[PDB]
Specification:
By secondary structure, this protein is mostly beta strands. It is built from one helix and five strands, in the order H-E-E-E-E-E. It has a three-stranded antiparallel β-sheet with strand order 3-4-5, with no helix packed on it. Strands 1-2 form a two-stranded antiparallel sheet. A hairpin with a 5-residue loop joins strand 1 and strand 2. The longest helix is centred in the first third of the chain and has 4 residues. The structure holds magnesium ion. The site of magnesium ion has 2 residues, from strand 3. The structure holds one DNA strand.
DNA sequence: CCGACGACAGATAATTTGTCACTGTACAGTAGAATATAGATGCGCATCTATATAGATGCAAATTGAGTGGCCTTATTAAATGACTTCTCAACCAGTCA
């Protein structure tokens, strides 16, 4: 039960080093140095313009690592794809 | 004189509200979907039915042609016309005369 509950501290102050699958760390020095992206389902069922059920949209977000500002999105019924 | 209860004032923690520091936990591709059933509706194919017969037959008038049966004055003469039958159809010698 303890081994599931373990907390981790966090980056503290203006210094941040993003670890890659290559074992290299990217030193994030300034705005637009490292953007990040992945997808998820939203948790609301939407309806068509007639009020009948469609499906839960997919949300994509692009974030800048240095500022943590949300730099762009895509929201739609469409599937994760290199197009999205 | 002694004991008990109410008025008024004074001090106080419980209650509520606010602020502040530390923290467990979700973000991690994901439940609309699969699998039965009844119940109604529609298209297709078969399985009868009821009507509609024209051809064949039987029969009964309606002539229709072809039969058959029943009823009737007669004898002489004469003429006319048309017919039939019968009969007949020799040849030279002997006695006058101009
Ligand atoms: Mg992802």
């Amino acid at each position: 039960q303890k081994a599931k509950s373990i907390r981790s501290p966090g980056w503290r102050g203006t210094t941040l080093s993003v670890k890659t699958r290559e074992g290299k760390d990217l030193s994030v020095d300034y705005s637009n140095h490292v953007w990040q992206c992945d997808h998820t389902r939203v948790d609301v069922l939407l309806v068509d313009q007639h009020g009948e059920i469609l499906s839960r949209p997919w949300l994509t977000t692009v974030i800048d690592t240095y500022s943590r500002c949300i730099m762009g999105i895509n929201l739609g019924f469409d599937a994760p794809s290199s197009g999205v």
